[PDB]
């Protein structure tokens with residue numbers, strides 16, 4: 002019988018008690034990255050994260066940081082491989098920058114051979130060290146040209162441009178890459194990119210944020226989400242019809258959270274909690290498992306919710322071999338009004354829920370996850386049991402899928418000096434406590450989880466935060482980015498992997 | 501009788517001997533800037549100078565600098581006005597960033613109202629201080645979307661997108677702006693952007709520079725130059741047909757140089773010198789004055805030189821009310837082979853000339869202009885008489901045009917400390933020696949020159965050089981960009997203007 006801790010102090014950093022041998026022999030352990038966050042702009046065209054961070058520097062991070070140079074994995078990809086080799090990792094998730102291989106967006110405009118060569122060399126280097134690549138086609142970095150031609154995922158033109166990009170990736174890299182992710186965190190671009198305008202491309206209703214160049218936060222999230230699902234599904238169909246000889250697997254990436262009632266004896270909070278599951282997870286998992294959006298979304302969102310045709314429904318339903326599930330934290334849910342006629346209405350209001358990290362009796366859900374220095378009542382707290390609850394829910398609700406945990410990690414402040422930054426015991430605690438619950442759910446609930454990739458390989462540009470936080474298991478000096486030095490967490494993870 | 505110095509030491513920094521009163525009462529004196537170089541990316545979309553500097557950081561400058569934040573004239577435009585007011589300047593040349601007012605490139609995709617407001621406030625502030633705006637529509641910063649959709653000026657689609665952009669500018673700003681420049685330095689994008697790939701977008705033949713993503717240095721410069729002329733001419737026709745009520749004037753910007761024979765008794769060097777005038781100046785001025793390219797270009801370039809239809813010829817011929825002439829330096833010319841079958845052939849080779857700053861007897865043409873620390877035999881030297889020779893030539897060869905000198909200036913090294921940087925006596929010498937010759941040519945040759953704008957108002961991002969050189973008449977601290985402090989040159993220029 003497995004017992005796992007939910008509160009500080011944690012004792013799962015002892016590899017005598019928790020290590021890779023606790024999991025099945027074939028289980029993959031590694032780390033993750035994304036292209037905007039690590040590569041730099043050298044050698045690629047411009048994408049909407051370049052555009053957004055440059056047009057709206059205060060939205061890029063408090064330091065106005067961006068991905069222009071970052072950790073320079075364009076130059077230092079071998080050093081990334083070296084970290085993975087030091088870890089004895091068996092997996093690495095990275096993304097392909099669309100703008101590096103097709104700078105002009107549309108494949109018929111030509112490819113960048115040198116960009117293709119960059120990923121060939123990375124892939125070959127990984128495989129030579131026994132590391133399985135997990136490759137994200139689209140980690141938010143849409144070529145700027147496509148956003149300017151037709152507003153990107155706002156328009157159905159995205160589907161064929163994404164398909165042709167993906168086809169090039171399968172053609173060039175699929176002989177070696179056997180695990181593909183289509184779109185990173187399906188929920189995020191619709192809501193943050195087109196709802197709150199916290200993320201690229203930065204569209205919203207005028208009264209939500211007067212700096213947005215255009216948008217409608219009530220309608221566009223739904224349009225974009227719908228196009229994401231269709232573009233994803235078209236790529237999965239292309240993969241499974243035209244690249245079956247490659248013997249690989251493909252799936253989407255979800256951001257997952259668990260949700261608990263703010264007041265577990267209040268029917269209204271219980272209802273809000275179940276609505277959140279539907280609106281947060283079901284928005285995408287309903288289509289992916291059934292070809293339809295959840296009924297509560299149909300009912301609430303009404304004419305703002307697009308319909309799938311019968312052909313589209315069939316294309317989207319079942320459009321995965323596995324799910325990449327990202328998991329960071331859990332929220333309490335309580336009811337909230339949905340003012341659909343307000344000029345500041347957002348899609349996110351349609352769930353009719355307010356989310357907190359403290360429940361009605363004043364209980365904080367778990368240890369600190371992210372401090373918010375401008376408003377401490379907005380601090381985020383984590384909840385290790387949430388990974389158990391999410392995986393159990395996916396198994397039970399969503400037809401026992403094959404799952405890889407494609408991100409899980411925690412930040413430390415960029416204000417810490419290097420010695421403090423390397424002494425990242427809070428990261429060991431977060432990672433181990435989640436791994437304990439992941440082992441527990443696999444054993445107790447028989448969830449088909451076959452790997453775990455911690456966020457992040459190394460310090461990088463963090464969307465929305467610049468270089469003001471660090472997520473890496475290895476440390477990068479922003480004054481001299483060449484080295485990636487394993488932190489205490491990376492050293493712990495090395496021991497966990499090879500105990 | 502006016503006597504002007506050609507060699508150090510110069511004594512024209514004495515405003516007792518040379519000042520604004522030496523020129524006609526109406527003559528405009530000011531300074532110049534461009535949008536990529538000064539504004540920053542905040543509040544605008546991405547353009548090909550963002551793309552180029554980010555994809556090819558070693559081509560942005562030795563420091564890998566770029567226009568992301570620069571002097572932040574987005575925030576500090578009032579401080580630019582303040583410099584101009586301190587100078588008692590009567591003119592200011594600035595550019596509109598296309599990506600700030602139409603981030604999606606094509607006008608039908610929507611405009612950025614806040615971008616429009618930015619230029620309205622600048623323009624209104626200038627006029628309130630008695631400063632005449634000279635506004636460049638296109639200072640190289642093409643929206644990235646257009647380059648990615650159709651490769652920008654490589655394709656005739658540029659013409660209508662440029663026209664619709666210009667129409668928006670005339671509509672929004674032409675009630676106040678009475679001097680418009682279409683395209684900055686017509687020669688530069690074809691040759692550097694599409695020939696040598698030193699400049700955005702960075703296209704060339706594969707053996708010219710293997711880093712180029714695509715291109716053909718032998719053909720594309722000509723295509724791009726042809727489209728520039730057509731796009732320019734379509735905008736001038738639009739202006740003069742639809743905006744005549746505004747009572748303003750429009751013209752192109754030329755980069756001018758003079759050319760002297762490397763050996764003034766050698767017929768081959770004399771011939772190369774005359775070819776250079778045709779290939780450098782006539783490439784554009786032939787079309788602008790006659791609707792045809794120079795015969796030597798027709799003959800040499802052959803099938804690589806596009807033809808104008810009779811309608812196009814008529815549109816381009818006479819498509820200016822004035823010329824903005826930029827002038828920095830003069831070169832000696834000697835013959836050079838034109839290897840049209842070589843895989844590394846460039847359009848620039850078609851002139852059949854090699855350019856130097858030292859003549860056959862070892863004479864350097866004038867004082868140092870720009871030191872090249874990697875190769876000192878590649879140092880640039882200036883030649884004050886060249887402004888006289890250029891203006892005389894334009895009057896005689898090109899039908900006595902109205903001229904404004906739209907740039908003239910010199911750099912100092914970014915390695916200098918602030919006190920050295922503010923003690924910019926080399927800049928006084930360059931500016932005064934050229935102003936002396938400009939007065940001389942107006943008086944002696946009756947060239948219709950009606951203003952002079954020195955490059956640059958303040959230190960900025962220099963194309964190709966990052967922040968490794970400074971051109972400003974006012975100093976900017978890159979650690980805190982708010983202030984623009986007049987250098988010795990700016991203080992001199994203040995006295996020259998109001999002696």
Ligand SMILES: *[C@@H]1O[C@H](CO)[C@@H](O[C@@H]2O[C@H](CO)[C@@H](O[C@@H]3O[C@H](CO[C@H]4O[C@H](CO)[C@@H](O)[C@H](O)[C@@H]4O)[C@@H](O)[C@H](O[C@H]4O[C@H](CO)[C@@H](O)[C@H](O)[C@@H]4O)[C@@H]3O[C@@H]3OC[C@@H](O)[C@H](O)[C@H]3O)[C@H](O)[C@H]2NC(C)=O)[C@H](O[C@@H]2O[C@@H](C)[C@@H](O)[C@@H](O)[C@@H]2O)[C@H]1NC(C)=O
Nearest residue numbers: 287288290291292293294295296297299300303308309314
């Ligand atoms: C998994 O996918 C299944 C589909 O493959 C989902 O089942 C569908 O659920 C639909 C409701 O979401 C349901 O459709 C309703 O059908 C009513 C019956 O119509 C038939 O008989 C009519 C009925 O009197 C007639 O007009 C129709 O022409 C048919 O003959 C119908 O009125 C409904 O329309 C009203 O409600 C929708 C909102 O739900 C409004 O958008 C619409 O304007 C109208 O106001 C609805 O019809 C659907 O209307 C929209 C139109 O685009 C669709 O094509 C039309 O179908 C449908 O019958 C079933 N299909 C079957 C095969 O069962 C299933 O939903 C879950 O299970 C069903 C039983 C129900 O409990 C749902 O609430 C659950 O979500 C999906 N499962 C999951 C887990 O999501």
Ligand SMILES: *[C@@H]1O[C@H](CO)[C@@H](O[C@@H]2O[C@H](CO)[C@@H](O[C@@H]3O[C@H](CO[C@H]4O[C@H](CO)[C@@H](O)[C@H](O)[C@@H]4O)[C@@H](O)[C@H](O[C@H]4O[C@H](CO)[C@@H](O)[C@H](O)[C@@H]4O)[C@@H]3O[C@@H]3OC[C@@H](O)[C@H](O)[C@H]3O)[C@H](O)[C@H]2NC(C)=O)[C@H](O[C@@H]2O[C@@H](C)[C@@H](O)[C@@H](O)[C@@H]2O)[C@H]1NC(C)=O
Nearest residue numbers: 786787789790791792793794795796798799802807808813
């Ligand atoms: C200012 O613009 C003026 C035009 O408005 C320029 O004058 C034109 O100069 C053209 C040469 O560049 C000249 O065209 C040549 O015409 C030859 C005569 O053709 C007529 O009689 C024929 C002759 O036997 C017959 O086939 C034609 O159908 C006509 O009836 C002719 O062969 C020439 O073609 C050969 O040379 C061109 C290269 O120059 C090759 O491209 C072509 O394949 C061929 O090998 C040339 O014809 C032009 O051919 C190209 C085609 O696209 C053009 O439409 C065709 O016209 C033309 O006659 C005159 N036009 C007039 C009205 O004078 C003027 O040029 C300068 O002055 C002229 C006198 C000459 O000295 C030029 O070298 C100078 O540049 C321009 N001025 C300046 C300063 O540039």
Ligand SMILES: *[C@@H]1O[C@H](CO)[C@@H](O[C@@H]2O[C@H](CO)[C@@H](O[C@@H]3O[C@H](CO)[C@@H](O)[C@H](O)[C@@H]3O[C@@H]3OC[C@@H](O)[C@H](O)[C@H]3O)[C@H](O)[C@H]2NC(C)=O)[C@H](O[C@@H]2O[C@@H](C)[C@@H](O)[C@@H](O)[C@@H]2O)[C@H]1NC(C)=O
Nearest residue numbers: 262263264265266267268269270271335360361362363364
């Ligand atoms: C978790 O949710 C539960 C369920 O909602 C909360 O308990 C409910 O709390 C209500 C007060 O917020 C209680 O109603 C009140 O009852 C007193 C005594 O009769 C009365 O004077 C009030 O006016 C009020 O009555 C309601 O007024 C509004 C009418 O529309 C409605 O019909 C009336 O019910 C309610 O009885 C209680 N329900 C239960 C089943 O206990 C619970 O609140 C926490 O516990 C209750 C017992 C009370 O001590 C609250 O102070 C305390 O906050 C909530 N838990 C937390 C931690 O918020």
Ligand SMILES: *[C@@H]1O[C@H](CO)[C@@H](O[C@@H]2O[C@H](CO)[C@@H](O[C@@H]3O[C@H](CO)[C@@H](O)[C@H](O)[C@@H]3O[C@@H]3OC[C@@H](O)[C@H](O)[C@H]3O)[C@H](O)[C@H]2NC(C)=O)[C@H](O[C@@H]2O[C@@H](C)[C@@H](O)[C@@H](O)[C@@H]2O)[C@H]1NC(C)=O
Nearest residue numbers: 761762763764765766767768769770834859860861862863
């Ligand atoms: C400025 O250009 C002028 C004109 O080209 C240069 O003068 C010419 O310089 C040529 C040498 O580069 C002289 O030709 C040579 O004459 C000597 C004496 O006969 C002879 O032994 C050589 O072989 C050579 O003759 C040529 O060989 C190649 C044959 O195809 C050709 O037919 C022969 O001419 C040439 O006479 C001279 N022309 C004139 C009109 O003087 C001039 O060069 C400079 O001055 C000359 C006089 C000489 O002192 C050169 O050393 C010196 O460089 C050049 N000025 C500069 C500074 O480069």
Ligand SMILES: *[C@@H]1O[C@H](CO)[C@@H](O[C@@H]2O[C@H](CO)[C@@H](O)[C@H](O)[C@H]2NC(C)=O)[C@H](O)[C@H]1NC(C)=O
Nearest residue numbers: 206207208216217218219220304305341344345
């Ligand atoms: C978001 O787009 C929706 C749909 O176009 C706009 O909502 C509508 O508003 C028009 C004008 O009021 C209404 O007549 C419709 O009844 C509404 N339709 C629905 C589906 O709600 C909403 O004004 C736009 N919001 C913003 C801020 O522009």
Ligand SMILES: *[C@@H]1O[C@H](CO)[C@@H](O[C@@H]2O[C@H](CO)[C@@H](O)[C@H](O)[C@H]2NC(C)=O)[C@H](O)[C@H]1NC(C)=O
Nearest residue numbers: 262263264265266267359360361362363364365
């Ligand atoms: C807030 O969260 C706390 C902690 O999960 C809940 O408290 C638990 O309540 C259960 C059922 O009453 C008790 O058995 C436990 O002993 C309590 N745990 C502790 C740490 O207090 C609490 O019920 C939640 N409040 C609401 C209103 O939902």
Ligand SMILES: *[C@@H]1O[C@H](CO)[C@@H](O[C@@H]2O[C@H](CO)[C@@H](O)[C@H](O)[C@H]2NC(C)=O)[C@H](O)[C@H]1NC(C)=O
Nearest residue numbers: 705706707715716717718719803804840843844
């Ligand atoms: C530049 O484009 C020119 C024109 O397409 C290419 O030049 C031609 O080369 C083809 C193949 O040799 C030739 O048959 C033609 O005779 C040439 N045409 C002319 C007008 O010169 C040139 O190969 C291309 N250069 C590069 C590096 O791709």
Ligand SMILES: *[C@@H]1O[C@H](CO)[C@@H](O[C@@H]2O[C@H](CO)[C@@H](O)[C@H](O)[C@H]2NC(C)=O)[C@H](O)[C@H]1NC(C)=O
Nearest residue numbers: 761762763764765766858859860861862863864
């Ligand atoms: C190189 O440039 C120098 C300077 O312009 C030329 O020298 C002048 O030559 C003229 C005509 O012979 C003499 O009258 C001057 O006195 C010379 N000036 C000085 C400063 O020497 C020289 O002729 C040029 N060389 C060539 C080969 O063209």
Ligand SMILES: *[C@@H]1O[C@H](CO)[C@@H](O)[C@H](O)[C@H]1NC(C)=O
Nearest residue numbers: 016017018019020022023500
């Ligand atoms: C691995 O952890 C298991 C408990 O899951 C433990 O029994 C085993 O001895 C540990 N391995 C090492 C080498 O410490």
Ligand SMILES: *[C@@H]1O[C@H](CO)[C@@H](O)[C@H](O)[C@H]1NC(C)=O
Nearest residue numbers: 056057058059211212542543
């Ligand atoms: C940040 O930038 C936007 C312009 O993009 C401006 O609207 C907003 O006021 C600025 N935010 C703060 C908090 O200053």
Ligand SMILES: *[C@@H]1O[C@H](CO)[C@@H](O)[C@H](O)[C@H]1NC(C)=O
Nearest residue numbers: 164235236238239240242243
């Ligand atoms: C598959 O490849 C063939 C060859 O390009 C193409 O005809 C077919 O449409 C593609 N298939 C998809 C997505 O099924």
Ligand SMILES: *[C@@H]1O[C@H](CO)[C@@H](O)[C@H](O)[C@H]1NC(C)=O
Nearest residue numbers: 208209340343344345346347
């Ligand atoms: C607009 O929304 C903000 C945040 O969503 C809220 O605090 C404010 O009350 C809203 N105003 C109206 C008019 O509803």
Ligand SMILES: *[C@@H]1O[C@H](CO)[C@@H](O)[C@H](O)[C@H]1NC(C)=O
Nearest residue numbers: 478480481482483484485486
């Ligand atoms: C930068 O870091 C690398 C790796 O530690 C080191 O070899 C190189 O010398 C350092 N550069 C400077 C300028 O210190």
Ligand SMILES: *[C@@H]1O[C@H](CO)[C@@H](O)[C@H](O)[C@H]1NC(C)=O
Nearest residue numbers: 021088089090495498499500
């Ligand atoms: C790498 O992991 C394999 C598999 O568990 C193990 O056999 C090998 O010893 C490990 N190597 C190192 C250096 O830890």
Ligand SMILES: *[C@@H]1O[C@H](CO)[C@@H](O)[C@H](O)[C@H]1NC(C)=O
Nearest residue numbers: 515516517518519521522999
């Ligand atoms: C201006 O320069 C002229 C010579 O061009 C001179 O005569 C005049 O006195 C100077 N003005 C002043 C105020 O020094």
Ligand SMILES: *[C@@H]1O[C@H](CO)[C@@H](O)[C@H](O)[C@H]1NC(C)=O
Nearest residue numbers: 043044555556557558710711
């Ligand atoms: C600069 O960058 C390019 C890649 O864009 C590379 O091809 C070239 O070798 C580098 N230049 C130098 C001098 O290192």
